[PDB]
Amino acid sequence: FASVYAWNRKRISNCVADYSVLYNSASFSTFKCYGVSPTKLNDLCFTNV
Amino acid sequence: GGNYNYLYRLFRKSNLKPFERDISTEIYQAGSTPCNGVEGFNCYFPLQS
């Protein structure tokens, strides 16, 4: 990974991504999301990420 | 007035019927798969000051 002052930005589109397969993963120290329920992210369509 | 005597209730998934009295102050845990994949985690105390 890059440094904090030179972070890398990557573009994702035209994907079918599942967040439930990653929500249940316990390999994360913290996963909290602001204003969006992660459990319902499997039923949301966004323009780009 | 009480600095921390006024609190609100953080919860979801159980939309209540209009004019419903809820006093079950239980710390939100599931003890099943949809809480960090284990039992005892995501045990968040709903009442927030």
Residue A25 with chain B: CB contacts under 8 Å: 37
- Please tell me the experimental approach by which this structure was elucidated: cryo-EM
CA B44 to chain centre: 7
H-assigned helices in A1-49 = 20-23
DSSP, collapsed to helix, strand or coil, labels residue A11 as coil
Distance from the A6 Cα atom to the nearest Cα atom in chain B, whole angstroms: 32
Alpha carbon distance B24, B19 (integer Å): 16
Residue B7 corresponds to which tokens in the numbers above? 């609190």
**Which residues have C-beta within 8 Å of that of residue B10, sequence separation ≥ 6?**
B28, B44, B46, B47, B48
Residue A19 near residue A38, CB atoms below 8 Å: yes
B33/A24 touch (CB, cutoff 8 Å), yes or no: yes
Closest CB to A26 among B12, B34, B36 = B36
Give the Cβ contact number of residue B22 at 10 Å: 9
